[PDB]
């Protein structure tokens, strides 16, 4: 599942 643009 890919992480949101700001998850990092």
């Amino acid at each position: 599942l890919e992480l949101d643009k700001w998850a990092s």
């Epitope: 599942l1 992480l3 949101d4």
Partner: antibody, heavy 123, light 108 residues
Framework: RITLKESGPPLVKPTQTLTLTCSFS??????????VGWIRQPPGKALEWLAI???????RYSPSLNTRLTITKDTSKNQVVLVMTRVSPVDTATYFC???????????????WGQGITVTISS | ALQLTQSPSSLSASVGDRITITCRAS??????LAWYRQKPGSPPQLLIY???SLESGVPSRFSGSGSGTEFTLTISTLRPEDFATYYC?????????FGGGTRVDVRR
């Protein structure tokens, strides 16, 4: 502050293409990290995420609708456009576009929504 | 993808009541969960962002807590305008999922 308004045809024939436009003010698609998303809601049903596009132009579509959706942005017009192909009656719903704050923490939410445009698919 | 389960899906209450509804995620979404209230005929309205932060302008009776896979929205004292449908949304993974919603109506 920020407001958004969806526009497009209220009535679309099955198979045809549905083109929606989100016009907004109070922010621009050149502010850092800012996004504009599309959410739909079938009559009496729950909200369904469709897609989102950002200032730097990356975008994401809902996995199930991604060979049918295309999201773009014209920054001189301050508009975002969503194109959905081969619509069918199940696509009948209210379509909302919404704003997502960019990093200044609170990017975790769609903070301002349009009033929504209800689109009916029928031949 | 990520399944967000809201419960109860339907809830009956009265003005002045204290209610707490939940939103469960199948995978951890850290604190990237938002809560909205939607009244019939109107678009969703942000209440809580980032799981526990009260959105500017939102009444103090609303509060949220949780992290990872468990989240709750509490209304300290139910008002007439609160009889609506509430939704949670996680913005940690793509696609951004919405829960199925919780319906709060007037008890009789």
């Amino acid at each position: 502050r920020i407001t958004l308004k969806e526009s497009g045809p209220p009535l679309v024939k099955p198979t045809q293409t549905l083109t929606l436009t989100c016009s907004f003010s109070g922010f621009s698609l050149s502010d850092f990290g800012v996004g504009v998303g599309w959410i739909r809601q079938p009559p009496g049903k729950a909200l369904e995420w469709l897609a989102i596009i950002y200032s730097d132009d990356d975008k994401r579509y809902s996995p199930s609708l991604n060979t049918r959706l295309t999201i773009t942005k014209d920054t001189s017009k301050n508009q975002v456009v969503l194109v959905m192909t081969r619509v069918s009656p199940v696509d009948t719903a209210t379509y909302f576009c919404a704003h997502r704050r960019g990093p200044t923490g609170p990017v975790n939410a769609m903070d301002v929504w349009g009033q929504g445009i209800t689109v009916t698919i029928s031949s | 993808a990520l399944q967000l389960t809201q419960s109860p899906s339907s809830l009956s209450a009265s003005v002045g009541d204290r209610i707490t509804i939940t939103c469960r995620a199948s995978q951890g979404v850290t604190s990237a969960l938002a809560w909205y209230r939607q009244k019939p005929g109107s678009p969703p309205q942000l209440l809580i962002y980032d799981a526990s932060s009260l959105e500017s302008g939102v009444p103090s009776r609303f509060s949220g807590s949780g992290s990872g896979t468990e989240f709750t929205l509490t209304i300290s004292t139910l008002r007439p305008e609160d009889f609506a449908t509430y939704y949670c949304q996680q913005l940690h993974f793509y696609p951004h999922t919405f829960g199925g919603g919780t319906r709060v109506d007037v008890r009789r």
